[PDB]
């Protein structure tokens, strides 16, 4: 990974009409499809489920075709209410009648390790070293490199997690702020600690459904059925948000800058989603974007096992469960926003968090 500064060079960079985001997206699709080919397919598990209350969790009993095909075995499993839909007490796994669920393989970690991007022969990568560079326009001084820095391919919705901090100042970017269909990216120059956890004491049970195919389910939670929560500190947050407010005063006509919760939509976009240790969290952010001292801003979260991110018609993903509890400490280094329109007058601009359009997470 060699770097060499290029003196007296100015180039017109463009973060939005780039191609490495459109290649990173397709390469994430390709690797996630390749890595889930030698894994279990839960097409035999699309059966009627006798589900009762154990809360958001349902104790579901159902029967399966075991390893000996002419014998049927009754088994039990704890499924969240978001992972099942009714058809009474009869349910089926969500997205069975539209998609082919594929269990994420155990003993193959899906950790977002840092990924460098090295240019091929005959090409080069220019990096812009200007600290206040928003993403578009000229750069003061650039550097040719072989391989980019370690880019963790994180998955998020409303808060960019484990990203690269801005060096000196908060960096705000859009294609055109007066256009409202275009997500506004905001890079924090100061990380905000966020510690989050699933406190349930799960016990994983293995279910054999075929020749070497195993289906891992939750079963028999021990102790209190507690709620997954996502803590942020009210100290550093709203300080960083006041800084963001100050910076967004200048990039528009003078108006009061203040924040609203997310609009209606799929729990995939109305809540800050991510992926912690293979467990998919969906934490509501209504407590962050609704209007100042030390404390904690504890956010309710909903765990979802059957999730279909980067929406491919006909595919899903059963994320297997983990025994014990887990904890999720990360560094918020970014923030995705959007702007409500209309002739609302009163000189206040309402910014809501925005989700979907996953390429934005790698534009940052």
């Amino acid at each position, epitope marked *: 990974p060699q770097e060499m500064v290029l003196e007296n060079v100015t180039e017109n960079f463009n973060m939005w009409k780039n191609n490495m985001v459109d290649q990173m997206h397709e390469d994430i699709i390709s690797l996630w499809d390749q890595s889930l080919k030698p894994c279990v397919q839960l097409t035999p598990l699309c059966v009627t489920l006798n589900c009762t209350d154990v809360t958001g969790i349902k104790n579901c009993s159902f029967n399966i075709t075991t390893e000996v095909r002419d014998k049927k075995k009754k088994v039990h499993a704890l499924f969240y209410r978001l992972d099942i839909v009714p058809i009474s007490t009869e349910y089926i796994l969500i997205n069975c009648n539209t998609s082919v669920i594929t269990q994420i393989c155990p003993k193959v970690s899906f950790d977002p390790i840092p990924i460098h991007y090295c240019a091929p022969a005959g090409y080069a990568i220019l990096k812009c070293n200007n600290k206040t560079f928003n993403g578009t326009g000229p750069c003061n001084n650039v550097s040719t490199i072989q391989c980019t820095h370690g880019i963790k391919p994180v998955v998020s919705t409303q808060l960019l997690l484990n990203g690269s901090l801005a060096e000196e100042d908060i960096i705000i970017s859009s294609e055109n702020m007066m256009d409202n269909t275009k997500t506004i990216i905001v890079h924090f120059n100061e990380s905000v600690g966020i510690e989050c956890t699933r406190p349930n004491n799960n016990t994983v049970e293995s279910i054999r459904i075929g020749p070497g195919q195993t289906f891992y389910v939750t079963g028999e939670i021990i102790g209190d059925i507690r709620q997954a929560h996502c803590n942020i500190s009210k100290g550093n947050w709203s300080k960083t948000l006041q800084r963001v407010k100050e910076k967004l005063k200048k990039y528009y006509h003078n108006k009061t800058i203040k924040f609203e919760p997310s609009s209606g939509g799929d729990l995939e976009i109305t809540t800050h989603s991510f992926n912690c240790r293979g467990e998919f969290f969906y934490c509501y952010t209504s407590g962050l974007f609704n209007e100042g001292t030390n404390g904690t801003i504890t956010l309710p979260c909903r765990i979802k096992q059957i999730v279909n991110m980067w929406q491919k018609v006909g595919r899903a993903m059963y994320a297997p469960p983990i025994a014990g509890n887990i904890t999720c400490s990360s560094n918020i280094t970014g923030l995705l926003l959007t702007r409500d329109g209309g002739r*609302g007058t009163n000189g206040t601009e309402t910014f809501r968090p925005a989700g979907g359009n996953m390429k934005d997470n790698w534009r940052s």
Partner: antibody
Amino acid sequence: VQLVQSGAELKKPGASVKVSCKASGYTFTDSYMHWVRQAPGQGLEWMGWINPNYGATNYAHKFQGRVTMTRDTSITTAYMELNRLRSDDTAVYYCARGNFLRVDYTWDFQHWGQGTLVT
Amino acid sequence: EIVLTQSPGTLSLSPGEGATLSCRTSQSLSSSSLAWYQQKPGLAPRLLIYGASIRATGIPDRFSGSGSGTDFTLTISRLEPEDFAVYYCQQYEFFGAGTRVE
């Protein structure tokens, strides 16, 4: 591009309407479904757009809190539900597909549906 | 907040004449941000020019337009009987009131 809208009816104070913009014959997922309010013999207004792959929606400051825009992709039909209608809601309602659908990236609403004149 | 005033007048004209229409923008935007629309009496509006210079499909040649910054302009050389309807200038989100031709 075929857009087949629904029929109108006068709604009393406090009711709820659910107008639809059933689409056909194109890539519904990669297509915004902006909604547009025609005041009676007056200038238009922008109700709001709805990305249908995620439901990510943005309404106008005027109707923020009174409206909600669901979408269905299986049958490729977008929805728009309006609660708490008053008698001053006299208008027409159309759905326009644009915003990079056409060559230009800026909002260039070309195809329009059939209209719905809920008073 | 982008104010789109339009010129007054009702344009009491006959077929075969010309028509000059104009729309003003409250901020220094490029030509790509403004479009023009035919507003028919009780039917679905259609688009002529998007980008202030690029014509749309299925549209005759008689309509042209240009402008940068402020004071964008549309000109029609030959008013057919169907062209005596209202015309709207569309911004990102806020439509125009609509200048009148009889």
